[PDB]
Design a protein around this ligand. Structure first.
Ligand code: PMP
Ligand code: PMP
Lengths: 404, 402
């Protein structure tokens, strides 16, 4: 299985055999997009050296990013990775008032650096006194499920209790950080109202809200540019992080914050940005705009959701279809009474889908949630093909399991 | 103000005025090198997706890097920055035996991430698990050129840190040093210092991290790696490298031993990127094809001789130090105390910039003129830079002496 070439939503092995890419969201506008390559080439022939001479590309990119965000999110710091962006977000939050503690979600994954291992319970084998883990707002397998009267308040009340317990111990809260939807956690979309209530409680403790959009930003949710905007025009994080999807896979990432948080940081340029990275970033924003990729994600996402609802109706292995736009999870279960993760069945389905040249993966803490997050040029034809291959595989698998 | 174009060792403003770049060592083989651009373009039109399909570029690059290093340094982890490489080096060290403490040098700078602030005393306006050893600076440090054996006296400081830590029931993961300090003001430790430190750290179960992020890839002229200036028998356990390896593209690497890698794998983020490895291979090919290591040796030796004559003529020059195209000019108000000439250095940078030479001043007192250009820097560039410096120092010392 040796991939050597990729174009748009497809990958090719050394025999030129075509594979449907449902995995590499980082190739956000499509693999080897000529418009991105051209932007990179033009800037690489001129200048690849950082803004001690505040370069037109960097100024224009930061203005264009800021234009996609709420009013108060106006100051851009450029980094080389989603992980660097998250590390900077924790420093901006901790420097803001000198509070040290960070509240994170169960099964969160924020990146692979030292500072991020500490706040990424997905990767806990050693848990620090300055990190608190709130129950993940998962209404399928979490502490409060779809039958609860008000899971958004019940989950948000868990954060308020962490805050009260920390205050009672004389500790202070720098930040609450959440993936706007959890990737590794298994495609978790928090309930309506949850983030807004959490932000209110964190603001009461002098903390800030960090929204990690590293996986879910740039129009993937179809209905908005930013996954956090799902929660209404009145939900505004204090810090937003973004990763390599913004560069179509080039090492570029960004943190956007408020004047107030930036000024505290200034009181004690590495984050000025790179001309080539900003040329690539601008070409990505232009392509999302010119090719209606946010609209594509909305339409193809709605089509995928409808196909998968019909798959759920005839396949008992399907416990839950969740997601929005081109961010979808298919939660596979051994039984509906207990929602027991179908880990071994998920691994088998990925192997069988790969034999039919569909590339996907399984996440969630039990590795049972099939993940769909393709390059944004994924078509209804690609969606139908993928689901046709899945239907066949599920039918054969459930007939085998159901055999005396 | 205002650079829009750069080629080789030169930068150009929007009027096409030419500037001599003595600053951007990250453009290691020269700004916008066509052979690096060509290699990036070819790979970017094919595949930019990480080795879940262990890519020929990544395998070939890691083999080529490993070939430039001592035998035991054979396992490559790829990252996006020098900072990411240093963060990974600390995790490799701490995971190796579960020791937590890191010994760093005074005035060290290892990067801008959380984990690196803690071990970068250049940026302290310290954690219990960080110990700061006196920097082995024979011009302004604790032990100077008149000491009988400064390499032993500096190494003995690390032994004492190790003993005090052990006595408190603490354990040492690592000793980390820039092979030559950049921010610290172009500091070349004495012969024997690193080898003695490595023996002491090895006795504590610790590992030696050599940070080559600024000083690697043939810059020292006499060797490929700055650490090899301490002899074929000095071998770090972990070596970090940064964006110079990609001519300024975000690529960086950690190389360690099988033993350290196996302890780490007991718990492909670091598999590398096809485009990054294509750029990396083009950089290695250019250093080889253009004899850039040889250029750094020859032009470096010429620069040193020019600057030795400037020192004889100019009392503001306290110390000329460096090797190849890593040079510091330590400016002093007086020789009795070696008082840093901070205000004079700022003035000299401003005047050199008016003559279209770009340099900077580091050291903890910002008095050390730094020369670390792209590696294609010529003897003609060296003569020009020094000619402009001579004139500026003559005018400045005549003014001060009225
Ligand atoms: C939420 C989140 N944050 C950060 C990262 C880090 O990615 P990168 O290599 O660009 O640091 C990832 C994916 N690795 C992620 O899913
Ligand atoms: C010794 C050293 N290490 C690491 C870095 C980090 O550079 P970056 O992480 O952006 O590539 C620097 C640059 N100041 C450095 O001088």
């Amino acid at each position: 299985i040796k991939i050597v070439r990729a174009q748009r939503q497809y990958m090719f092995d050394e025999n030129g055999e075509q594979y449907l890419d449902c995995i590499n969201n980082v190739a956000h506008v499509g693999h080897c997009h000529p418009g991105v390559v051209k932007a990179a080439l033009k800037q690489m022939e001129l200048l690849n050296t950082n803004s001690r001479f505040l370069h037109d590309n960097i100024v224009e990119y930061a203005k264009r990013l800021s234009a996609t965000l709420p009013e108060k999110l106006s100051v851009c710091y450029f980094t080389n990775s989603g992980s660097e962006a998250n590390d900077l977000a924790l420093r901006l939050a901790r420097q803001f008032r000198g509070h040290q503690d960070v509240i994170t979600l169960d099964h969160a994954y924020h990146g692979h650096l030292s500072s991020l291992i500490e706040i990424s319970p997905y990767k806990f084998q050693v848990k620090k006194e300055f990190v608190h883990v709130a129950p993940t707002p998962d209404t399928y397998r979490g502490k409060y499920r779809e039958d609860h009267a008000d899971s958004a308040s019940a989950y948000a009340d868990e954060v308020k209790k962490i805050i009260e317990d920390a205050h009672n111990s004389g500790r202070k809260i720098a930040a609450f950080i959440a993936e706007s939807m959890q990737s590794c956690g298994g495609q978790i979309i928090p309930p309506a109202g949850y983030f807004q209530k959490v932000a209110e409680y964190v603001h009461g403790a002098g903390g800030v809200f960090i929204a990690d959009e590293v996986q879910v930003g740039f129009g993937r949710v179809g209905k908005h540019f930013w996954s956090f905007q799902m929660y209404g025009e009145d939900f505004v994080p204090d810090i937003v992080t973004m990763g390599k999807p913004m560069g179509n896979g080039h090492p570029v990432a960004c943190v956007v914050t408020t004047k107030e948080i930036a000024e505290a940081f200034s009181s004690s340029n590495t984050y000025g940005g790179n001309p080539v990275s900003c040329a690539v970033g601008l070409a990505v924003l232009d392509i999302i705009e010119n090719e209606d990729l946010q609209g594509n994600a909305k339409r193809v996402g709605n089509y995928l959701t409808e196909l998968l609802k019909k798959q759920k109706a005839k396949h008992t292995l399907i416990g839950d279809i969740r997601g929005i736009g081109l961010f979808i999870g298919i939660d596979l279960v051994k039984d509906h009474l207990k929602r027991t993760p179908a880990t071994a069945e998920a691994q088998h389905i990925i192997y069988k889908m790969k034999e039919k040249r569909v590339l996907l993966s399984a996440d969630g803490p039990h590795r049972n949630v099939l993940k769909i997050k393709p390059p944004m040029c994924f078509t209804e034809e690609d969606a139908k093909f993928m689901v046709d291959q899945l239907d066949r595989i599920l039918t054969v698998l459930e007939e085998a399991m159901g055999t005396k």
